Amino acid sequence: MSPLRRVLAELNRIPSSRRRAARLFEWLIAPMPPDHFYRRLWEREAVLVRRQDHTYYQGLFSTADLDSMLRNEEVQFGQHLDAARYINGRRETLNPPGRALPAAAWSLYQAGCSLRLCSPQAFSTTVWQFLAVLQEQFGSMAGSNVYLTPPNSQGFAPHYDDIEAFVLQLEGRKLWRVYRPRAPTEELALTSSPNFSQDDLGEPVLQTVLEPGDLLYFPRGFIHQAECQDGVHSLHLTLSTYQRNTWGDFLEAILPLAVQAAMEENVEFRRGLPRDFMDYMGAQHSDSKDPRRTAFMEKVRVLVARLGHFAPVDAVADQRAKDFIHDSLPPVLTDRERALSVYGLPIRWEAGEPVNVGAQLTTETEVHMLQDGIARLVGEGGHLFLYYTVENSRVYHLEEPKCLEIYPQQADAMELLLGSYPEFVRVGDLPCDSVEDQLSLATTLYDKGLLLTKMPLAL
Amino acid sequence: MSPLRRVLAELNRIPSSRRRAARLFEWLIAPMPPDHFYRRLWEREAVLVRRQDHTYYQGLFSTADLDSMLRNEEVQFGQHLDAARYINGRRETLNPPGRALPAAAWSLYQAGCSLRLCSPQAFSTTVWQFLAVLQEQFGSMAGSNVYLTPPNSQGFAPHYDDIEAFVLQLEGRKLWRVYRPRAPTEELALTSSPNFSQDDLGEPVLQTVLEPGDLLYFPRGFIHQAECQDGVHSLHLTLSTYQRNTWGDFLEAILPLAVQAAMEENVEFRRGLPRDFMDYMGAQHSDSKDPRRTAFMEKVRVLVARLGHFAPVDAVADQRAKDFIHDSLPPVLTDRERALSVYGLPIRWEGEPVNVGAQLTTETEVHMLQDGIARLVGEGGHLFLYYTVENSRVYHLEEPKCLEIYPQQADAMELLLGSYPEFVRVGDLPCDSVEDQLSLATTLYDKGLLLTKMPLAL
Amino acid sequence: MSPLRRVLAELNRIPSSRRRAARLFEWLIAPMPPDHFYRRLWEREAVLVRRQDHTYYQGLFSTADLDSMLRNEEVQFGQHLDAARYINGRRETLNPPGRALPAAAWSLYQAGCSLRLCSPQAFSTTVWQFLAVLQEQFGSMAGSNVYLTPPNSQGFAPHYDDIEAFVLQLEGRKLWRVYRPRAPTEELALTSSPNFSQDDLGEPVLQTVLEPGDLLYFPRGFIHQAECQDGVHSLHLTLSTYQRNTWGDFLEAILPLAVQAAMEENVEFRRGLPRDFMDYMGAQHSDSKDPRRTAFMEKVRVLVARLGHFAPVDAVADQRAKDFIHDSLPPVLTDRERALSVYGLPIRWEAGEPVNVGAQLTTETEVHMLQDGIARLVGEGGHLFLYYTVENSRVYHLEEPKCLEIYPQQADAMELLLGSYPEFVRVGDLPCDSVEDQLSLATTLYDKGLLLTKMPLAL
Amino acid sequence: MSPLRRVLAELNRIPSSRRRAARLFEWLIAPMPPDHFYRRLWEREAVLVRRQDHTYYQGLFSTADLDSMLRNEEVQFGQHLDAARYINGRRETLNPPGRALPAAAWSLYQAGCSLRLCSPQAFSTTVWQFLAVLQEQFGSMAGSNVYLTPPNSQGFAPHYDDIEAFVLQLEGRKLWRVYRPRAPTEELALTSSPNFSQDDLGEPVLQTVLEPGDLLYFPRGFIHQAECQDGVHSLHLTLSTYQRNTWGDFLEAILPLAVQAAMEENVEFRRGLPRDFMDYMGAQHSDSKDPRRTAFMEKVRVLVARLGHFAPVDAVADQRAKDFIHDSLPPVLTDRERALSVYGLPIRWEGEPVNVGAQLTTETEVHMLQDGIARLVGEGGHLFLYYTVENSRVYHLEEPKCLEIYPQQADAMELLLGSYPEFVRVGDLPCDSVEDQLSLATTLYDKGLLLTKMPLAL
Amino acid sequence: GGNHQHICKP
Amino acid sequence: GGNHQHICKP
Amino acid sequence: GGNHQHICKP
Amino acid sequence: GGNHQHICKP
Ligand SMILES: O=C(O)CNC(=O)C(=O)O
Ligand SMILES: O=C(O)CNC(=O)C(=O)O
């Protein structure tokens, strides 16, 4: 089979979902080591991996998969599919109002337009699994866009995006040009840029024709543009991640809580401001010599620096974690996990009644979390909530945040479980208050598809 | 005449409104010097000033003024008037639904209930003037509440408030007890407290009988309680200010913007977080010996400290200034200021309007009506002059008033705001052309924000 | 004194507020009888009353009252005061942004502009009392606008208004022109018209110079315009009433409830529509011959006509009444009512304590409603609410609807009271269940300023 | 093959979608003639049709389809699946929080709970097709619920529903009891009822055991209850329709507009009310002998009766039509319709797209894809064609879809909507120019709203 | 500009 | 509990 | 009941 | 026209 189907097959044969994600990423950038890539390339340099194996991504996505998608799925223009053109320095969009029927889409294609399909994971099970696995090692949502460009044309103007982009060339060839950030402010930019023109660009740091199987990575802020030539089309899937997952976004959540804490715990933050500070502070008093102004400025800095001591970093981490649980795509279980989870319980309906009912967990049952990135224990208003991802839709935020409450008498074993993965812990050895608690938690988690047993449960 | 009517008559003779504010505060805490008060007493200790003059506040407010207010104005129970009773260690409110008529208000009072009238400045012009002047030297909104308690009783349970309080004894006598903050957290408390019981308090740092003319000052967070005894009532006015005007509130506004500017001007704040920080950061991972956790912690502390550099202090300063202007009571004008402002123009009606047509000239000498009525702030890409002249005596009844200032006048607008109270010849404004000097002056003047050395004549 | 002060003095000397309102209206249109005016002129014809007594309205309002108003009250442009100009067929408004200081207002006036002051009742106590009394005999809110026009000018373009207008000429002279409705649809129009031009008007049904003391009435829908000439100004107060108080507005509230009732009480309204009515009903099937269409139309008419039998006319009347209570201006009591109501209770604060406390009502106390148009008993969700106007602001809807609940054990006496005015009913004879009820109601009403006693209450 | 697979295979051979809807309903209630049913039975009496064929519905739905749905699709408890139990005269719901997994669903079933799956049309394509076809002949939305009850039990308490119900017995047997409305008010009830007890019911007008293939019809307002006995389960599908499609609902929309037009075109509705009607009209004035009251009453009745003349019936008709179109499930196409519509165009992908470029011509013969997919309605000052082709099988998941029709095409658009299923040559449309005939046709066709007699070729 | 205002505008 | 859901609402 | 109302809110 | 959509637009 193809390299993609061979590695996918391997993943099924690996216990830990953490190892699974690490193994897939290793495959994605092979032969270069993930450790080198993360300590030297990630967010610092554009990276081109010439695979020299056109079959590398076979089974991931094709123009046929898209053809059958537009025809069988309800793909909507403007929402899921975008037809773009770039001619004589101007970007244009010829998006018709409505469903993207093959007749209309391919028609645009013939007219010289490029097709951009947002989040193919919402339809392709193979793309979903690919991304669903990679998100775990990114610690950040992994989305993707598919780009289809006709021969001798360019559908997009030069621009930079707000995420870390991995361009996987799936069909055809395409001449790419990646530019280093133009100015300091553009380095690792927060928001996407507008459409630029050649006159706004310097020399390319990397210019090359991509061939099926190659991988091209570049950080957010790197301007890039691509075009087809010599009578051949191009199809590629761009894997993006790390959208607004910077130190700033973290501080953005910290500060508010930190200043609130500092005020509640330290009187220096509760002291009143000067009665007349408005006499020397303000835009009109910028050009002043008053020493009270320099003292005001010094006081502000001093107070700001203290804030670090009151920062609830753990709470914010849990909230980010929680948001990442809501953002995550639902997990793709291995055959083993399935067979050992409530999802694979033998109970079904066969002749005129349900068969094999009565599967119960005992104190002897050995268990462990279905996977390492499906749930998170978060504290909110003296309450403990176990947020999970198993019930998430493949469509971003289609479903609201799912969680179940955990009582103090179970928080201890719940912690252990989230930390024991993939080690098997016997229910009887769960650190609780009573046997009723140990079976309670285990049963509640199991029935929610958040837990698996060492052996399949039998009546 | 009484000290009050004399100091007010004295204020009407003082040129600067800043000096006028300073003088009235000097009077309010006399013989104690303002400099000492603010330096050693403000926000630090409870202060009792025994005036030894029962006429000191005569003219400010009285129970008779209360009777007329309840009778001639629409004082609403729950909103304007509160009737409270404190008995057997428990606070209770007995506000009927509807308008506060004298027959109802005095029936509660005779029933041993204490009356609290919120914001008498909205009804009484003397109180208004008092607060309107003091707010200027406070740099913060000056509110007030009038408290009336019947003989042999207590209307309120022990509590502390979220503002700096100045208690003026108007009539009668009352036994006050003031306590120093109980815990570090209660010192300069941010929010008012619940009603306490006797056993929640320790010994008083100040216990005394207040008589007409005395002043009692205590910081936010100081628990205090009072009661009437010996068969006599009590009436006092509690002047308050400094509600949420702390360095914390300032920071609360500066930080969001600080990280916003840093993220834009410094890549270090734009670097992605660790791919696995969720493995060692979080409540459950509190005891982790992971050396990466302390590194994460350290970096967070280094980034925060850096934020001081990006802090747009002046912008927030202007914002709080704009809020204080919206918060401010309308200015009380001296005869001279009125006579020289648009408010005093002789243009009236006698079958036709008389004395109309006066206009400013380049020779006209002008300056701001007062120093605490306007503020120039830039919001977005344009300039705006926020003023208080059109505010209601009722808190935030009206909306934030302002007028746009064009760049060709910004310089002149700034000068006027800072050169107070020095008159400046309109023909000497920093503006590019003559039309721009006259337009600004005319616009400001017509808004009741400017005054001239000589009355405008046609 | 002046005719206005003489009649006002008389009103104080009349018991019934109903008679008071009837007496004031009689004065307003004198010498013509109200009965003739209402059965023949009201809403049918323009009416001019040449008083031949320039002092008729003295004490009502003057240019001086306005001068001192702009100076002492907080009059805002656009909200309370409007400066209007009408030149060369075009209406213009030169409203400055902000407070209407005398300097600015009179300046506009000198520039040829007219001043319109909305609802002078909000400031003038005399205008308030005038309107507060007239609303009672109108059964509809009585508002007013004051218009001040400079010599040799016109501030407004021809137009018609959505209310019944009574123009009282207070100072100066003014040439008026009133036109009959132009078309059927314009007769008793629902909404105000735009600004018309002379070319849109026919011949005047009434053209005349008004002099101080005169009254000019015209119905909504009658186009009118006025101008000054010959070097003299004009001041007039326009009393308006009957805004959207038509049969249509009443039906507008009825229908919804009627159809809901009909559906709940009659199965014919609950039967399903034809499965295929969409085949012959619709804009595209308008030009059809299908008899099912004529049957559908006949069915609709038949059902609509039935609706009258299910109309909750009383409920809607109470709701309108209630809305009129909310709309009404607070009452102006006579010296007698005051002295006999809680408002005039002798209790005050004199030396160092309140004097004369302890006024109590007994079963012997004879009482009756303070006035006939201050309260209304309304049923809402099995509950009884006595809505009143005593706590209303002189500023329209400044205060929300005021009411007090009435329990079933008191509804009987509450009814009697509202119907006994101005007859005195002894509390002991109130039809209730217990003496506790009779004193309860009486005391609650009295203390709310909704009731008065035959004699002043004494300790 | 079974009757179902045969009638469906028969539908795929019927030209008109209207006749197709008629045939399927004819099948659903066979041998009973539709004409008799609608004339004498619809909304009047409960009807039991004993098919005497247990394979009648084979292929429509089964418990196996349910198992797969719970397993392979995201059926959510509370929203999609409901587990109910009826014991000791009391109804109870036992829905766990979360996803409906087989292990949970079958555990409740074995616990004697009944399962109710709401709107299987959103998951099962056979049910969808069934309802999509029947909605056309109902003139109203056709919904459905699948009910599965374990042996020896009752899942639901006696109740009536707010819709016309058609109960199809899919598997097993069940004891049904249907009651005629108890009171005049309950006849054709507007809203569903609460759970009743045995003592709230009288004697059944219909009591019987349903076996696979049978059909039970009963009107809204008929109380009904069922239970399983003799150790066997039950599975039925309840087809429902006619929710709030009464003359009252129609009136509910016509009246507001009626008085709105009357008030504008008839002065009598613009005349002021009486100045003192409040004296004799109102609850308290109910027993008043005031002859003015009856006059007021009479006038109100005369005015209402007049409103019929001003009623914009056609407008509301179009509005309800637009709502039915938004309410409609997407159309199920026959092979022929697909082959002749944009959906069937051979334009696919083989390194380049093949068979692309086909376009309509004036010679092209066309007609609407189906008769219940579009509606032309005027809202405001423009025309709009609302269609159902882009709707989701999930109720109101998508928003009301339409396309504006220009006046130059209104006539042609109307013709097409009415001339179905007669093909019309595009060159023969009522439009002014040739470009307008081709533009409309092309626009409609590309939207999947039109079909051609011959497949488009390039 | 407007005409008579039975109720004072916003 | 509820009855027939012509329209699944929750 | 409440305490000092720096700003009358109700 | 837009560029890469990490999350699908409204
Ligand atoms: O393929 C193109 O023309 C442009 N592609 C991108 O911007 C991308 O993949 O991020
Ligand atoms: O007067 C009292 O009983 C209580 N007074 C206060 O809390 C005050 O003036 O702030």
Ligand SMILES: O=C(O)CNC(=O)C(=O)O
């Ligand atoms: O006085 C004018 O110019 C216009 N007056 C009116 O429209 C009026 O009084 O209703």
Ligand SMILES: O=C(O)CNC(=O)C(=O)O
């Ligand atoms: O099957 C049951 O117990 C109840 N069924 C119904 O109410 C129905 O199908 O509408």
Ligand SMILES: [Mn+2]
């Ligand atoms: Mn008018």
Ligand SMILES: [Mn+2]
């Ligand atoms: Mn049912």
Ligand SMILES: [Mn+2]
């Ligand atoms: Mn206090």
Ligand SMILES: [Mn+2]
């Ligand atoms: Mn890109």
